[PDB]
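Annotators were shown the component list below and the corresponding predicted structure, then asked to write short factual statements about the assembly.
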Amino acid sequence: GMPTPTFLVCPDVVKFENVGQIAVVNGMVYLGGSVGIDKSGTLHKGLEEQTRQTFDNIRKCLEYANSGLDYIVSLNIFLSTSLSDSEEARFNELYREVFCVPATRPCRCCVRAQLQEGLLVEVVNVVAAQK
Amino acid sequence: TPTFLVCPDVVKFENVGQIAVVNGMVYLGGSVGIDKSGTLHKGLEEQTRQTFDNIRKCLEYANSGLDYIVSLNIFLSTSLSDSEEARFNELYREVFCVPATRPCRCCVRAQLQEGLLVEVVNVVAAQK
Amino acid sequence: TPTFLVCPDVVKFENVGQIAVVNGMVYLGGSVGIDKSGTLHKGLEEQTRQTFDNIRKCLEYANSGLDYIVSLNIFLSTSLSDSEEARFNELYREVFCVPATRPCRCCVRAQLQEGLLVEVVNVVAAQK
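Structure shown to annotators:
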């Protein structure tokens, strides 16, 4: 028999009806899309606060799933098509505060897309190893 | 070297590997609302149902299934209205009807190839 | 923690892990038509060829190769015409010239960073 994937919900991170928050399979963790919404369901104001909240959500989910930010292998970034050059640059400044070791930064891509209402940034396809 | 499969009952695109099996995991190429004969169905409803039928058949051909999907990505056409996006999600919940085991997902708008209203990509699933 | 590698013959971007190896699988950061010196090539063909050359070099550096790719995603610039997208796919079939082993693929238009006509992301490959 083969092992089942397991689906988890970190109680300190917002959970969306249509979206698996965390999946674990064969020592690997996958996350559903993460956005700058706190546990109370409040979307934070501006690129910076949405970015900080997004990576806080990711950190909490990964640690809940026996992983962590330093175990992320790959992730994708969707920035809103509405963002200015300064907002995109600020995102990357904040990104480097989350992943502070240049040598071990995870695989990344980043493109502009039309996100759901109010969203300035979304981080998707987070793949991480378990501890 | 990775094993590539083609389910005979699902459309196969020239440039696109349909199914890959690697170390008990199944990966799929992009899926759209085109049936076995190569006919693109009209409208979001029919395209959505056909897309997930394609995914289901591909996964079952590799002894996986919808219930063993860990993650997927959705691209909806930029042309879709809010009500169309809402309708997509209603249909999505009819495919994944067990709330607790819904796969990781993300959903954004994109400029898709001609005629396409929805595309589901990066489907990753475990073998049963 | 997972092993991150840098192939010294391929450009590395400040914010971007170039190569990650985990449990006999290789993941790549986004690849674009920029050479080792950091020069973005002019035109779709040269950017396309450079992008897949970068991918080839990274995979071979990580005990893998183009023939071990399981899945990848393509983002083409929204500025590209239909004829240019067709040209990209011709070039794609030159690189992946064995039809049966072409990796899982999806391809959509997106607004890429300055100057970029094509970007290949989410490359996942098995190790030898």
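Statements collected:
1. The first strand of chain C starts at residue 3 and ends at 5.
2. Residues 44-61 of chain C form the longest helix (18 residues).
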